[PDB]
Design a protein around this ligand. Structure first.
Ligand SMILES: OC[C@H]1O[C@H](O[C@H]2[C@H](O)[C@@H](O)[C@@H](O)O[C@@H]2CO)[C@H](O)[C@@H](O)[C@@H]1O
Ligand SMILES: OC[C@H]1O[C@H](O[C@H]2[C@H](O)[C@@H](O)[C@@H](O)O[C@@H]2CO)[C@H](O)[C@@H](O)[C@@H]1O
Ligand SMILES: *[C@@H]1O[C@H](CO)[C@@H](O)[C@H](O)[C@H]1NC(C)=O
Ligand SMILES: *[C@@H]1O[C@H](CO)[C@@H](O)[C@H](O)[C@H]1NC(C)=O
Ligand SMILES: *[C@@H]1O[C@H](CO)[C@@H](O)[C@H](O)[C@H]1NC(C)=O
Ligand SMILES: *[C@@H]1O[C@H](CO)[C@@H](O)[C@H](O)[C@H]1NC(C)=O
Lengths: 467, 472
């Protein structure tokens, strides 16, 4: 007789907790809002265990994956309620014909700039270097944004034609991935050049960028609505405008739709539906959550019509319309990880843009996931994906030999030993140790695998500290 | 990775003294400033291997050593490297319990063995033989009481009687336990289990008795005796019952052989906090002080720490625990134990339900114990059951028989989803057979599956999966 909700920390969870307080008051059912770290990865683990929240708040891109594991309850809202929200929202949360969650809002990255430092922000990425040299002479910096998450660097990568998945035959095609093409190479290459010229640092993350911009150290940042609140608390007067173009083309951010899924194991499903439908989604509730932190353009029409008046929301919908809606298919979980690697390594010099993006193309389509330990004593772990509906025989290439893995069904696991021979029971051990360019601290252990269908190859790699 | 650094998360069973351990965590947090959170999930022994393979889970897990081998076979446990002086602080056989393939995979907090707890007022002399239970019950039944009530659901409680006559889990040969040799189907186990089923047939015990029913019956004075471990004593201390703790009754002139567990703490391989866990275990938890706090919350039985053990043996209850323990055997840590226990469990259940004869139940159990397979039953129908097959070194093929059909399966480890109800998620889909009725039990409903295994040498062997579910 209680509702536990999971939502990210950057989103306002305080307002949502106030909504939960309203609900508790009326019906007497307590509502607790929590914000675990890396909740999108932690949710499947515990949901398969039978634990976890009744409701989970995340962008729709992950939800398909959850729905593939039977972790999400099916949504059956009334036709009136469906009419209360825009249709494209619902369409984003539709997976295999069924509604797996409730759309709460639309998110797209935008360019937030300091008007006092930069009254006229640039309309192109190519001007960022020239600006930087100027601002660095005054003790400031042109642009700082999170390079650790690919969500923030994707607009530049996709502007020139880089794309996550190609849509063909009524579905997103997994065998066609656009991370390795000329457009992505041009965008990420431009980023790496910006890092090599010291216009940006490869270690900058979300909190570093927020601290730099909100305190007036940098003139510009790239962020979404959730950040604006903090900037309103600072002394920085900020505009929100279109992202800079790249090679004369508009930056294409991946557009998320904040959605609330219902845990399939929850006994409270009726109460979660009551709370979300008749409490959370209203002018009042969305207004509260918006007060704590902005949601961007909400899916609820009545309140949206009032939010569009906000020029920041209008800009959010401009960048959103220039971008694309993220697919919700499970493979996204792989994509975001793969790209997350390519940007980081390429930014750290660990890999060339070409190698990083090729490995990212092979990884973005994932029949396998690797868990790299931080200690050489414990082996790495290899967990295959489900592959509901191909997957004939996959041959792994290991130091001690090759390990075949054939078909079967469901989930398949294999332990990849770090470099020790233990005696020889058909086991796989890593390659290496191998050198890591520009870094003497970390060494690299790799493995390759060749997948047969009814002729592709992936490369798994684990970086580890030396001492 | 997924585990929070700068903090220690600990998992321990609900019956254990987790509160005291959390007070130890208050001491450790005060001294080092590192918070320690103690949790007691349900089915933690089964839940740990699922989340720990993904890099999540606790930094430290508290369980009997029998499971740890499995965890170590999957690479889910870090190696333990205490100082030789520290190794000498504990009894050698404890270290041998947590030793797997030459490495120490955990710290053996305590020693656990089942004992016979009786009411002094109701029974002046505790029965020295199982064969005396049938008569006494009939007498106590006339007073509105019962002779013996103990949990029949978990095979840990029924194993002492089954093994007394020569029933054994695994044969030890050439310095190693023999996987192909199972002593569940021998004459001794048949005699013990037949005697239990005879106690049920004669209404001397109810097949539905579980930990809660037995604890409630004895602690409130409804039954004269119960079979339980040290952790239960606390509850009885809360009751008004004056209770003795003594040796288990003999069966066919032979002592009951309870499986002796060693309460141990393993360190999750994925934990970044390993150093903090080591410091905590060596310099805080294993001490007279810490084990005294945990002891006050719940009794640990005979601890592996000599300094505190020497003080515990003075307790006649601990002396009885070590009597039944030395009369029993230390549980093997090999992974196949996971298959052994389930087997016995299922068998006993069948035998008590009347679904099968003792002979059939124990033969089927013998087939179940040798395949090194596991099953995770879910408390909800939305999330399926998980049927895991581990490759130790062998099975040529395994074919499942499911409602929707049969699913054939041919390195590494393989987890398969056994579905209770078809869902939106499936070429190799396997759905449980059921639901099926449970005699005597309106609440719980069971789902079954049968799988056939071809080793490629000798006969094929079939196993049976059973998962139980509540109803409304
Ligand atoms: O970094 C890739 C990441 O992108 C999206 O995550 C966003 C999320 O949509 C925002 O609401 C906010 O939390 O920022 C996140 C990135 O820092 C996807 O939702 C996620 O699946 C993906 O991994
Ligand atoms: O009966 C199956 C079960 O037996 C043992 O579990 C014991 C445990 O060792 C004790 O510490 C205490 O928690 O009681 C448990 C039974 O209720 C085995 O350790 C375990 O592996 C096995 O599944
Ligand atoms: C396995 O990889 C190594 C390099 O890591 C390569 O030299 C070798 O030819 C590969 N083996 C096969 C069978 O492809
Ligand atoms: C080397 O890699 C490590 C990751 O373990 C990182 O912390 C460090 O900053 C890197 N150093 C350089 C010079 O890139
Ligand atoms: C039903 O069977 C289960 C076996 O797991 C047992 O624990 C329980 O006590 C029985 N009776 C009820 C009412 O659940
Ligand atoms: C599969 O199980 C059913 C019982 O549900 C049984 O009737 C049938 O004979 C089994 N099939 C095989 C091939 O064993």
């Amino acid at each position: 007789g209680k509702l536990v909700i999971w939502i990210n920390g950057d989103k306002g969870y305080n307002g949502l907790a106030e909504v939960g307080k309203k609900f508790e008051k009326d019906t007497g059912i307590k509502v607790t809002v929590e914000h675990p770290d890396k909740l999108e990865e932690k949710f499947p683990q515990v949901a398969a265990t039978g634990d976890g929240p009744d409701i989970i708040f995340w962008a729709h891109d992950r939800f398909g994956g959850y729905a593939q594991s039977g972790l999400l309850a099916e949504i059956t809202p009334a036709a009136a309620f469906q009419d209360k929200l825009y249709p494209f929202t619902w369409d984003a949360v539709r997976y295999n014909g069924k509604l797996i969650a409730y759309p709460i809002a639309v998110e797209a990255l935008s360019l937030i700039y300091n008007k006092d430092l930069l009254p006229n922000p640039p309309k192109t990425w190519e001007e960022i270097p020239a600006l930087d040299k100027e601002l660095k002479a005054k003790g400031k910096s042109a642009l700082m944004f999170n390079l650790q998450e690919p969500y923030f660097t994707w607009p530049l990568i996709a502007a020139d034609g880089g794309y996550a998945f190609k849509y063909a035959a009524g579905k997103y095609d997994i065998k066609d991935v656009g991370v390795d093409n000329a457009g992505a190479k041009a965008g990420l290459t431009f980023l790496v050049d910006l890092i090599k010229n010291k216009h940006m640092n490869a270690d900058t993350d979300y909190s570093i960028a927020e601290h730099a911009f909100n305190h007036g150290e940098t003139a510009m940042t790239i962020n979404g609505p959730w950040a604006w609140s903090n900037i309103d608390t600072s002394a920085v007067n900020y505009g929100v405008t279109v992202l800079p173009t790249f090679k004369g083309q508009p930056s294409k951010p991946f557009v998320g739709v904040l959605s609330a899924g219902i845990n399939a194991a929850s006994p409270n499903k009726e109460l979660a539906k009551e709370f979300l439908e008749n409490y959370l989604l209203t002018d009042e509730g969305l207004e509260a959550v918006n007060k704590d932190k902005p949601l961007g353009a909400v899916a609820l029409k009545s309140y949206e019509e009032e939010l569009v008046k906000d020029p920041r929301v209008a800009a959010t919908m401009e960048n959103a319309q220039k971008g694309e809606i993220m697919p919700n298919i499970p493979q996204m979980s792989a994509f975001w990880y793969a790209v997350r690697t390519a940007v980081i390594n390429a930014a750290s010099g660990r890999q060339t843009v070409d190698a990083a993006l090729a490995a990212a193309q092979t990884n973005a389509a994932a029949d396998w996931d690797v868990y790299c330990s931080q200690d050489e004593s414990i082996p790495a772990k290899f967990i295959s994906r489900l592959v509901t509906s191909a997957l004939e025989k996959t041959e792994i290439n290991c130091s001690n030999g090759l390990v075949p893995i054939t078909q079967e069904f469901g989930i398949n696991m294999m332990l990849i030993q770090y470099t020790r021979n233990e005696d020889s029971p058909g086991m796989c051990v890593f390659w290496g140790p191998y050198s890591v360019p520009k870094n003497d601290t970390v060494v690299l252990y790799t493995v390759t695998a060749r997948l047969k269908w009814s002729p592709t190859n992936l490369s798994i790699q684990c970086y580890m500290p030396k001492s």
